[PDB]
Amino acid sequence: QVSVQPNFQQDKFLGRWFSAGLASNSSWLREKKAALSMCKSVVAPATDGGLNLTSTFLRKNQCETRTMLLQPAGSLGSYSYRSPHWGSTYSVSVVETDYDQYALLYSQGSKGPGEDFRMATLYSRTQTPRAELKEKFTAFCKAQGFTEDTIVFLPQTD
């Protein structure tokens, strides 16, 4: 499919991240993420050997929590996510990370009505990604076929 971080170390990937940018071919998805003030993501190991990715965002007076189970897909750093509301499964890959500052993720539909869906995600360890990491994300999005108009930095969904 796409590249996975070589020698991936899942335990170094755990803990607190911030969703700092995204690109997708779904316009409603980009627009809604951009509109949301999101708070942390937290990555913790799941019982199946994969990860629970728990994201938080603000709506009105409250911080909502959402947890996605990323099941192991058979190479370290690659997962599968099943979305019952969308009747679809997606591949999720950690394409590149240095563990201590940033991670570049790529997701694509694999089965179901969501098969055509594609999304790149920037995770940062801080809420203020440096310029060089924003430029790395833009260049990673372009390597995946995303046009500039499809690339969103999350000001404080971040």
Swiss-Prot record:
Entry keyword Hydrolase: no
Principal subcellular localisation of the protein: endoplasmic reticulum
Keywords: Cytoplasm, Disulfide bond, Endoplasmic reticulum, Fatty acid biosynthesis, Fatty acid metabolism, Glycoprotein, Golgi apparatus, Isomerase, Lipid biosynthesis, Lipid metabolism, Mast cell degranulation, Membrane, Nucleus, Prostaglandin biosynthesis, Prostaglandin metabolism, Secreted, Signal, Transport
Listed result of changing residue 33 to A: Increases enzyme activity about two-fold
Keyword hit for Transmembrane helix: no
Subunit-level organization: Monomer.
Protein name (record): Prostaglandin-H2 D-isomerase
Organism, as annotated: Homo sapiens
Upper taxonomic lineage: Eukaryota, Metazoa, Chordata, Craniata, Vertebrata
Full-sequence range covered: 27 to 184 of 190
